Design a protein around this ligand. Structure first.
Ligand SMILES: C[S@@+](CC[C@H](N)C(=O)[O-])C[C@H]1O[C@@H](n2cnc3c(N)ncnc32)[C@H](O)[C@@H]1O
Ligand SMILES: C[S@@+](CC[C@H](N)C(=O)[O-])C[C@H]1O[C@@H](n2cnc3c(N)ncnc32)[C@H](O)[C@@H]1O
Ligand SMILES: C[S@@+](CC[C@H](N)C(=O)[O-])C[C@H]1O[C@@H](n2cnc3c(N)ncnc32)[C@H](O)[C@@H]1O
Ligand SMILES: C[S@@+](CC[C@H](N)C(=O)[O-])C[C@H]1O[C@@H](n2cnc3c(N)ncnc32)[C@H](O)[C@@H]1O
Ligand SMILES: C[S@@+](CC[C@H](N)C(=O)[O-])C[C@H]1O[C@@H](n2cnc3c(N)ncnc32)[C@H](O)[C@@H]1O
Ligand SMILES: C[S@@+](CC[C@H](N)C(=O)[O-])C[C@H]1O[C@@H](n2cnc3c(N)ncnc32)[C@H](O)[C@@H]1O
Ligand SMILES: C[S@@+](CC[C@H](N)C(=O)[O-])C[C@H]1O[C@@H](n2cnc3c(N)ncnc32)[C@H](O)[C@@H]1O
Ligand SMILES: C[S@@+](CC[C@H](N)C(=O)[O-])C[C@H]1O[C@@H](n2cnc3c(N)ncnc32)[C@H](O)[C@@H]1O
Ligand SMILES: C[S@@+](CC[C@H](N)C(=O)[O-])C[C@H]1O[C@@H](n2cnc3c(N)ncnc32)[C@H](O)[C@@H]1O
Ligand SMILES: C[S@@+](CC[C@H](N)C(=O)[O-])C[C@H]1O[C@@H](n2cnc3c(N)ncnc32)[C@H](O)[C@@H]1O
Lengths: 144, 144, 144, 144, 144, 144, 144, 144, 144, 144
């Protein structure tokens, strides 16, 4: 039944993200002390530009390309199956199987001095099935 | 009953915002062509830095401080009441009671090259009672 | 300079109004898709008998007096700052300065079988600020 | 140059119209004391249901169809080269070139309880070249 | 029955007539506030030499032949058909059913020491169907 | 250099594990609030009889066998490239890449009444990349 | 210098243990032929519940409480001083210097069907100074 | 019962003994691989001049007096509860009650060139209770 | 039955040997006072370098090889069928039977500074049938 | 030189003898603690009838012919070499060489009232090479 549900309901309390210049070893700590596993990589403007995960992180360091002291900009995960918040859990349940996570985007349309429109994409969160499992374990009392 | 409803459920399709350098005259067009009157004023990084409304802009143009060719950066509406998307309708409905509009924000905590957290507030969108009315009109069908 | 202009100069094209029996939400949907905010409440004869505005409507709905399914007549915003089309832009601009909207009316005198005179008032149009702001933006391309 | 100008500029302070039930002897009187030539005929709802002119009337009286005590509604004039106030003076000029009068109208879009649109034609006023001649001496001080 | 009624018995209001030198517009604005449409042009005494109307002026002015600032002499409408006061209402019907007005003349036969018979055809006035309609309305009161 | 390091040094403070009867949703909660990802499934005697990981378990919920209220015993996950505690980081670096984790085994040789030996495998912990990733940063101060 | 060292480096390959049910004499034989002196006593679940030593044996066997053919659980040594593997070598130093043998333990906490937690204590390896002396004579080759 | 028996019956294994100058670690390894707990210290002539024990040796390094590479004559133990082969098992068992081992000695009456009598003490071997317990483990099947 | 018995169970009386540097006359003296038939000859280190018997003396004195003042090392007897202290009494009795004396030796495996294994041999004692004949009367009360 | 010596100087103090009925072990014990090997067996008057040694007695006991409890008379060794005291030491020494003992007999030459001379040969004693060895050792002191 849960696949009926929608992305926004899932409580993406995930404001955390990184710059590409963050030291690899530091991110390793932050995720673990938080218990997290993957962190979004954006610019200081917040523009979505990549990902970082242990799976590529361990693979990269063990590949010998970088040190833990290196910056994540050079080991940036980018192949995320990113989804939109407006979508349903079925798509989430679909996508979140081949890998543990996927980005949810929020779109931002700015207009220039001359009224010319522009588009900015923002991070709504970084979700995993735990959020799905956590949410599905409780909310079924209300809108099942 | 609807005041219990959760804010993110309100179907905000509101990515449009403006740079402060946009000309007032063009600004009116974009809102009026959209049927809008108020729009977020943000930087190129999406920094929540003010507003623009009907009363803000009508008073400003009638006061003569901004010509129609003037930029909105001079008269950016600032006294907006603001809510968070994780909040509830009842307070937002309360919030909308004494204003024409309300701002919803979001947060995104970037982490430095040194791994230090840095919190950035990000625009979620712009809500007027139409959004509440439009959704509660839909909730007439969804309360099943 | 524009405030000296005649009210009729603006050209408030749309004469869109409602009867006091249409469902509250239905009014809201019609205005919102078109982006409107208000609608004159007149009889089938067209006699100006009131107004309805979202600021009243949001307050009315949140007051609990009307469901969205309720009729619009019971929340008739019959009070309005009303001006005549034969009047000056500045005073209407003055009128809109501290109001969410303004009303203009069209007079009409009928003579019965005995020729005794009568008076009727039709709606010339409904004006908000963005009428003027767009109009002065357009008109200053011709007369300025 | 004036023929290019908009209809509404011509100061059409002409709200007077009659019910069809008014007698012949009173219609002539009012138009005579007003110095008028013709008078619109509408219902109590303002529906544009006819006309009456000296040419229509004189032909009617001299044909014997209406006694002076008879109603103008029996011989209600209804033909006219009707125009709408959004148009230009040249078309008004064009229409008045061969008719003995010109008719201008106005619109009102009422909406029912079911949200169904209803465009209602409404009288704006009666115009003759006097309105042109009176006002042509005026705009040659404003736009000329 | 009224067709028998004597033209003299109608009781024209009065003659109003100007000299050809004065401009059209000044005559035009005067006649209209009296409600008039057509005005004679005579010599220093009242001899028939000219005739002006709105119908020909509007036709001529929009044709561009003369301006409203042009003298009233160039808008002459003397091609009228003319009647004598000794005739009856029926003759007016045979006149006014087509034209917009009728001319009635009169003789001011003053006698002097010049030694010859004198004849000076005066203008008796300007009569329209309103006079006819007023006269038949009045005669229906006399014949009561 | 780190592959020189030995498995024993890593310090897996990982005594936590589960029974097969543990509730599915409770299982995910337990790891999540603590921030873990997977915990061994053993009996009350500590026998290494299973494993629970989100990737199978998210698939397990999507397979429909388990609701969050279900037990993990019916979806007990039992494949793991388990490593031995005496090895080096080279094996860990090798083994721990193709999956996110691997069991580390302690062993126990119990002797019967007749002196017959009996080997019993024990869980020394549950390791992922962080354990070494944190450790490699630390071990550059002690052994290298 | 070695006293600083970590216990787990000491090659504590002592998975062997006994059930209480086995006779005393065989256990003494078992440790004798394999060369040990003392062996840990646990249940079939591997729960640490006792010990057996030469003094625990000879004194009891000379006390007459047990025949050599008597069961070993009768003389289960339990007054050992106990340490955890996570400690340092100097902690072993001030343990074996007065005790004739040393016990080390490993911990394991299991989580129930209801999610409640319970710890299990598991033997790591029965160690005496020879391991230390063997290890310290060996590890200095790694350092130097 | 066995305490009535005779020491010589026990059947010692062998006299594995060392010189004082032997390295501490080599004795440590030798007793390890042999499983032994101690070894007598004698000269090349076999004179009973010392002993080396686990408790002596563990205390020796941990007191810092000898490195593992140092020679054992520095810590030469001689406080053994020495016994003679001719003595009884019960006394030996009593003798082993507090010491972890008991030296068994042997005599040799060597005469000189002049016939002067002299006694040369000889090491018969080394015994722990494990000898006795194993010894009684079989003797109860033949001499009982 | 006694032939089944063992060296150690039979037991020695006492060991007495001498250096070869003793004179022949005193060798007779010590044996004759003891009634001994023979004597082992070793160094002060106890190495079994020879022995002396009655048959050695009778041949030696009557061959003129040694005077009583001469040393036995001149004619130190060397023939002897050496036996070990592990051997069945029947063999001992057999092995003694054809000879006139027999010797049992005791092993002594000592280790050097470099821990190199080395086995020296030690004299256990001299045995004649008296050792058998006296003890056989005793073990018939112990084994029988 | 000693071959000149005689039994009269020999000092054979060997008068002890046994009866044939005495038990072998009883004779064995007596001979052993005095330290002899061979024992004379004579009648109650001292007349020569028997002789025994250990060499045959052990051999006979090992042959199974007699037990140690058997009488000494059945284990006789009379196949000795017998000598007379009048014979020189050289012949004495010569004759004892190829054995372990020799017999010397007593032939006193006085008689009694029986009326006839005869011979009742008593044993003079039991000499060994040790006697000679003791004798030659002593006589070397006497002659020098
Ligand atoms: C505690 S971690 C558990 C580790 C597991 N491998 C995973 O990624 O889900 C999961 C929780 O952390 C939160 N989280 C994941 N990524 C995050 C991020 N980049 N910033 C802040 N929170 C995040 C999610 O809301 C999720 O509920
Ligand atoms: C249809 S307009 C009606 C006029 C109304 N007074 C207003 O502008 O907010 C309102 C709708 O547009 C959306 N909206 C308002 N401001 C917006 C903005 N700045 N960018 C994008 N959408 C916006 C809101 O969600 C609301 O549902
Ligand atoms: C496209 S709408 C823009 C959205 C905004 N709510 C509004 O109505 O102004 C612009 C025009 O709608 C007109 N308008 C507003 N209320 C009206 C009403 N009740 N009937 C007809 N026109 C109306 C305004 O005068 C304005 O010129
Ligand atoms: C003052 S009369 C004089 C001109 C001429 N008598 C005629 O009626 O055409 C004409 C003026 O009266 C006004 N008028 C004409 N008919 C009208 C009517 N039916 N109701 C109100 N005003 C009217 C027109 O604006 C026009 O400017
Ligand atoms: C409004 S006018 C009659 C309508 C006619 N179409 C006109 O406007 O001239 C009303 C009265 O004015 C009078 N009248 C018309 N023209 C006149 C003139 N030129 N001088 C004096 N009276 C005039 C007529 O007698 C008529 O009774
Ligand atoms: C904060 S969790 C992050 C998620 C990680 N993939 C995991 O294994 O759960 C990382 C730490 O949790 C610890 N851990 C993992 N499984 C555990 C378990 N079953 N019991 C106790 N600790 C565990 C590991 O030692 C690791 O250092
Ligand atoms: C080689 S034996 C030497 C004799 C020693 N005195 C002792 O305590 O047994 C000692 C070795 O056996 C190992 N050991 C001790 N107890 C053991 C047990 N119960 N099972 C398996 N190994 C054990 C220890 O780690 C130590 O390294
Ligand atoms: C075979 S080891 C068995 C291992 C056991 N941990 C121990 O040392 O007792 C035990 C045997 O070795 C013998 N032994 C002990 N120390 C000895 C030594 N220094 N030289 C020769 N044998 C020794 C003991 O007499 C005992 O019978
Ligand atoms: C007591 S004498 C018995 C009678 C006779 N003298 C003989 O030797 O057979 C023999 C005993 O002395 C002991 N013995 C023999 N030669 C010895 C020697 N060289 N040193 C010490 N004891 C010896 C033997 O153990 C034997 O039990
Ligand atoms: C000391 S024992 C040992 C010598 C010899 N191997 C033996 O066993 O007969 C020998 C001495 O005892 C003495 N002797 C031998 N037989 C004897 C006997 N039957 N009675 C008394 N003395 C005897 C001899 O004189 C000799 O000096």
């Amino acid at each position: 039944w849960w696949w009926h549900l929608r992305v926004q309901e899932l409580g993406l309390s995930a404001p955390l993200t990184v710059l590409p210049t963050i030291t690899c070893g530091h991110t390793i700590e932050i995720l673990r002390e938080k218990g997290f596993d993957q962190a979004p990589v954006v610019d200081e403007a917040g523009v979505i530009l990549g990902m970082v995960t242990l799976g590529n992180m361990l693979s990269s360091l063990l590949a010998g390309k970088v040190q833990p002291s290196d910056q994540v900009g050079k080991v940036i995960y980018k192949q995320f199956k990113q989804i939109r918040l407006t979508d349903t859990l079925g798509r989430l349940s679909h996508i979140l199987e081949m890998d543990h996570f996927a980005l949810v985007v929020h779109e931002q349309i700015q207009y220039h001095s001359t009224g010319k429109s522009s588009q900015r994409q923002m991070v709504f969160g970084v979700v995993t099935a735990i959020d799905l499992l956590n949410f599905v374990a409780a909310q079924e009392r209300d809108q099942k």
